Design a protein around this ligand. Structure first.
Ligand code: MG
Ligand code: MG
Ligand code: MG
Ligand code: MG
Ligand code: MG
Ligand code: MG
Ligand code: MG
Ligand code: MG
Ligand code: MG
Ligand code: MG
Ligand code: MG
Ligand code: MG
Ligand code: MG
Ligand code: MG
Ligand code: MG
Ligand code: MG
Ligand code: MG
Ligand code: MG
Ligand code: MG
Ligand code: MG
Ligand code: MG
Ligand code: MG
Ligand code: MG
Ligand code: MG
Ligand code: MG
Ligand code: MG
Ligand code: MG
Ligand code: MG
Ligand code: MG
Ligand code: MG
Ligand code: MG
Ligand code: MG
Ligand code: MG
Ligand code: MG
Ligand code: MG
Ligand code: MG
Lengths: 32, 122, 179, 200, 134
RNA sequence: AAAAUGUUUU
RNA sequence: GUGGGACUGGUGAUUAGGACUAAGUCGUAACAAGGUAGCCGUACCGGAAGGUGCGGCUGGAUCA
RNA sequence: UCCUGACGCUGAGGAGCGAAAGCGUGGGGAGCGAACAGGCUUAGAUACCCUGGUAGUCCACGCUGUAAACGGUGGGUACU
RNA sequence: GUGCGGGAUGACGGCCUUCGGGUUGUAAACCGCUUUCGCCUGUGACGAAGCGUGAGUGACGGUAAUGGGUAAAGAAGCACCGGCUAACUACGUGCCAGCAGCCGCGGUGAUACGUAGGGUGCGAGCGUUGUCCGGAUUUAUUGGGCGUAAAGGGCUCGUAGGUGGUUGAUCGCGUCGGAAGUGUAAUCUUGGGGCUUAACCCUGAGCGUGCUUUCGAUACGGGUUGACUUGAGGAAGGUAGGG
RNA sequence: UAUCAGCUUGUUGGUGGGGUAGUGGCUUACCAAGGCUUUGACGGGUAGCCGGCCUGAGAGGGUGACCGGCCACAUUGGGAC
């Protein structure tokens, strides 16, 4: 493994988790 | 996989991506030129590639390249659109058939005339 | 001339140095007699002719006999060196060498005139050549099969194959005398 | 549907004498055109294609019909190249040429298509008529005195008739003893190369 | 656990032949003894013998002694199992397999006992294609 | 002991 | 005809991230011990890369 | 030595177990220590380093069910 | 089918050039021939062993076929020429105009753009587009893999399922071998025959990869049934450990 | 196609009657509580099926024009004569 693959997946996951943290309230008001 | 695994769940092929959905199973489709303009190609190339947003008769609107040195078609010009990709142009998957409907053959062609709709000259 | 050869592939390899890159040329040659002895040579040089000559002279000392049952392979084989798998099957006379470029060159130098060869696995010319080579080396001539099994050719091997071998030997006689 | 252009150009390109001798083929070692004297690479396709084109322009057969001949030979039992050459030789114009009633295969095609010949009693004007064994080709009685016919009657003694034909020159009658074998067709192409070509 | 004792016999023979062992041994079964017998009759092994148990005192032991020619040359070019327990292979009298272009022998269990392809074809009888020893 | 960066030629 | 559901297409102010393009701005997080070894799960924090805690990994190493 | 006499193997779905962090109720809280506050360094330092320091780390009962949960190598068997 | 043979003086003209020439090119000119198709004109069917009491009766149809006449004439285009891929140069253009299926080409010496000469592949076609299969073993039954390339479930228990050590007997479901029936014709493979050849057409056979019925075989798989202990589990004794 | 897991109440079976060329929940009355389904019922999507056709070394993959066989339909829905 070149660790680059893990870094790419790491950034994608971290960005999605940040999106979930910033949109936590709206999802529980109407949605998942 | 084991033979029992293949029996329980067999092989499945790939999806076989389609390339020209707007044609909808037709070799070429008629359309109207909703916009005629020029686009800068992607790098490493550089030019002013002539393209047109066309409303094809399938109801789909796509960008079509206009091949050959010379161009007459303009707004609301009826064209025939065939398949064909322009590699250094993202989002262009169709070309305009020269010499058919409103678009006309390239003026000074003497070689590969049929591909540009140029009638033979005496 | 005396020994028939094909240049399978040439490649421009380079070595990076402080000043820049030191390019070099590699040559695959297949040299055979056309009657059963064949070999392959790899050549390194700064120039194409030098690499080719080095490969040819290196191949001369790697000639191995191939058993031909009358201008065709004795029996089907599957060879593989590294990742280059090559399948060979005998074919009826007049079929020709239905083979890919490198394997076809190897077979044509070996003298096989009716063969069906397929290239499975990697398509690298060197590895495909080695796979064709050991596929041919896996060939097992009917007399030595009989010696292996402690029996006779008439007891082990197909009558059609033996017969075709006799008629091939007879055309051989023909050519010889005619000369 | 027939090559009418120069044949020496094709012979020079293919590197071999397609027909005749003692001619403009003194410029043989190089193909026609401005770029003729340059050194050539000659791939395997190049080689194969050259053999196929040599056969085609020798026998005056275009690509579709030559391909049809190829599948017929491939289906037939025996050596595919042998059967293909046998078919091409069994063509009627080639039969007239080999019997020697024509100076060249083009002249044979001319007379055959013009109908100066009878096949075992029936008039045939098809150059591709495949002559069968024990057949009797006859010159049309009206056209027994053609100028090309009398030239052939003057010259046939020098010409060599293959073993599978018997010719009554002055009578204009070509008896087909048997359908020819590879040893009887003159070796001037690589039918094996053609067979390999039609497999890629 | 053991699933295909015939495949175990074949792999024991292959491994011993590859390692140049003179003899190989295994628990005995009737079909194993038959295959060993036809291997000997076809000349792929020097001999075979069924031994009454005297070490484990439990069951018969089938022992194959192999043959290597001049300059230590393998008499077996390979052996392969065809009719696997997971997927069984049956061949008709017309569709009998050919091994190594006919040089090798397919071992076929027919209704008339174990018979090499050549034999079966002569008797026009098919069966279960056990092995492809060549 | 901390001590950043290096557009678009043809 | 009346009524209440099921499924589904288009569209939607506004909003979210993705891809590509200036040869834009802001830092330098990773690749060498990348200058605080990196990464995995999780947690919180921060313009942004990221920072830190807890446990784990070597796809790190020092010194043997 | 004894007993049973193929009772074996694997196992979709399913079920259980499953580091640490996290969550709920209650307890506990020395040390450590996200967050946080301050001091330094710096062009800036929402960091490294320093002084403090809350959850947590601990206990009871649940929940969560994820890890580079790695030998990055599924289980069983025979042979070399 | 658009011609065939001969024809060097290797003519002019294009194009290229090292200004020597080379090339188009036996190509042309020129000479001698032939008349398929087309055009003109004559003869002129089979299909009807039909039908009709007879007389009479062919839509196709003056059709096919065929005699005569004309003139070498009325009859060649399309794509491509950087590599894969058969076939190269000059001029124009100057990351512009444009090309491209991929690699890529064009920034002043472009065999890749445009034109021209030359060439190559095909030819009454030649290209482009669309779609399918192939190449692709790139879903691998034939015929692939999972330490690091994409791929071992976090681990175990266990249900259905898949799978089964040695051996006696028996059944004959799988399996194997005959027989009968069926698998229309056409297609397809192949042997003969007819259209001037071919395509096409007729005819004999094969194929129709199965199924049903029936008669056999019992090596293997399985069912039924009985043994054996070596796999597996248990008893008794011994025993290690941050389970 | 499981990002459709439950479906069915003349439904499953029984007895008597009716009906029909004819067997039959085809229909009817009464009795019983069945029937189908993770080996995928029910639902969604698409589609006339085949002899064949194309491709392929084969195994397969794609397809269902002409021709030939079966089915379905004839402005849409229903109905009988
Ligand atoms: Mg491999
Ligand atoms: Mg909107
Ligand atoms: Mg950094
Ligand atoms: Mg760092
Ligand atoms: Mg912080
Ligand atoms: Mg007992
Ligand atoms: Mg679970
Ligand atoms: Mg915890
Ligand atoms: Mg707590
Ligand atoms: Mg608390
Ligand atoms: Mg601190
Ligand atoms: Mg662990
Ligand atoms: Mg994993
Ligand atoms: Mg497991
Ligand atoms: Mg294992
Ligand atoms: Mg070339
Ligand atoms: Mg230029
Ligand atoms: Mg495939
Ligand atoms: Mg494809
Ligand atoms: Mg693979
Ligand atoms: Mg594995
Ligand atoms: Mg991986
Ligand atoms: Mg694991
Ligand atoms: Mg899980
Ligand atoms: Mg079980
Ligand atoms: Mg068993
Ligand atoms: Mg028994
Ligand atoms: Mg027929
Ligand atoms: Mg005939
Ligand atoms: Mg039939
Ligand atoms: Mg049993
Ligand atoms: Mg105990
Ligand atoms: Mg009733
Ligand atoms: Mg429909
Ligand atoms: Mg279908
Ligand atoms: Mg029909």
């Amino acid at each position: 493994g070149s660790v680059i693959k893990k870094r790419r997946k790491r950034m994608a996951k971290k960005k999605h988790r940040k999106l979930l943290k910033r949109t936590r309230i709206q999802r529980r008001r109407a949605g998942k | 996989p084991t033979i029992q695994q293949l029996v329980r769940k067999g092989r499945t092929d790939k999806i076989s991506k389609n390339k020209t959905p707007a044609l909808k199973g037709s070799p070429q489709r008629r359309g109207v030129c909703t916009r005629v303009y020029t686009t800068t190609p992607k790098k490493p190339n550089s030019a002013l590639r002539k393209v047109a947003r066309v409303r094809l008769s399938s109801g789909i609107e796509v960008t079509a390249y206009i091949p050959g040195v010379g161009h007459n078609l303009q707004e609301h010009s009826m064209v025939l659109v065939r398949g064909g990709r322009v590699k250094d142009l993202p989002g262009v998957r169709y070309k305009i058939v020269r010499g058919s409907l409103d678009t006309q053959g390239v003026k000074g062609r003497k070689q590969a005339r049929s591909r540009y709709g140029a009638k033979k000259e005496k | 001339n005396e020994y028939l050869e094909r240049v399978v592939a040439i490649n421009r390899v380079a070595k990076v140095v402080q000043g820049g890159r030191r390019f070099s040329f590699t040559a695959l040659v297949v040299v055979g007699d056309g009657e059963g002895s064949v070999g392959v040579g790899y050549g390194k040089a700064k120039e194409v002719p030098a690499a080719i000559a080095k490969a040819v002279e290196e191949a001369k000392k790697h000639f191995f006999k191939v058993p031909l049952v009358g201008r065709t392979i004795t029996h089907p084989v599957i060879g593989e060196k590294a990742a280059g798998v090559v399948m060979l099957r005998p074919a009826s006379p007049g079929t020709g060498v239905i083979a890919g470029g490198s394997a076809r060159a190897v077979l044509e130098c070996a003298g096989v005139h009716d063969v069906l060869a397929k290239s499975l696995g990697s398509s690298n010319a060197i590895n495909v050549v080695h796979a064709t080579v050991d596929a041919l080396q896996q060939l097992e001539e009917p007399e030595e099969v009989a010696r292996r099994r402690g029996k006779s050719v008439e007891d082990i091997a197909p009558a059609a194959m033996l017969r075709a071998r006799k008629e091939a030997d007879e055309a051989a006689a023909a050519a010889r005398m005619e000369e | 549907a027939r090559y009418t252009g120069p044949l020496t150009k094709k012979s020079r390109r293919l590197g071999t004498d397609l027909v005749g001798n003692d001619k403009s083929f003194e410029r043989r070692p190089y193909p026609p055109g401005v770029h003729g004297r340059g050194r050539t690479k000659d791939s395997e396709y190049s080689l194969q294609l050259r053999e196929k084109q040599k056969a085609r322009y020798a026998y005056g057969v275009l690509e579709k019909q030559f391909r049809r001949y190829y599948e017929e030979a491939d289906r037939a039992q025996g050596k595919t190249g042998d059967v293909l050459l046998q078919i091409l030789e069994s063509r009627l114009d080639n039969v007239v040429y080999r019997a020697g009633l024509a100076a060249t295969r083009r002249q044979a095609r001319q007379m055959v298509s013009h109908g100066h010949f009878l096949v075992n009693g029936k008039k045939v004007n098809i150059p591709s008529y495949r002559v069968s064994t024990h057949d009797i080709i006859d010159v049309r009685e009206k056209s027994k005195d053609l100028p090309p016919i009398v030239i052939a009657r003057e010259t046939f003694e020098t010409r060599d008739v293959p073993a599978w034909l018997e010719v009554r020159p002055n009578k204009g009658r070509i008896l087909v003893h048997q359908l020819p074998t590879r040893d009887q067709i003159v070796i001037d192409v690589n039918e094996q190369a053609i067979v390999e070509l039609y497999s890629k | 656990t053991m699933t295909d004792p015939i495949a175990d016999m074949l792999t024991r023979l292959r491994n011993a032949n590859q390692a140049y062992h003179d003899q190989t041994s295994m628990p005995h079964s009737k079909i194993k003894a038959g295959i060993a017998g036809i291997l000997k009759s076809e000349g792929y092994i020097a001999d075979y013998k069924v031994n009454e148990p005297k070490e484990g005192e439990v069951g018969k032991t089938l022992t194959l002694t192999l043959k290597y020619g001049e300059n230590r040359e393998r008499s077996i070019a390979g052996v392969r199992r065809i009719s696997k327990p997971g997927l069984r292979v049956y061949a008709k009298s017309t569709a009998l397999p050919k091994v190594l272009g006919g040089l090798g022998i397919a071992i076929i269990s027919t209704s008339q006992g174990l018979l090499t392809d050549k034999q079966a074809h002569e008797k026009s009888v098919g069966g279960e294609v056990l092995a492809y020893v060549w």
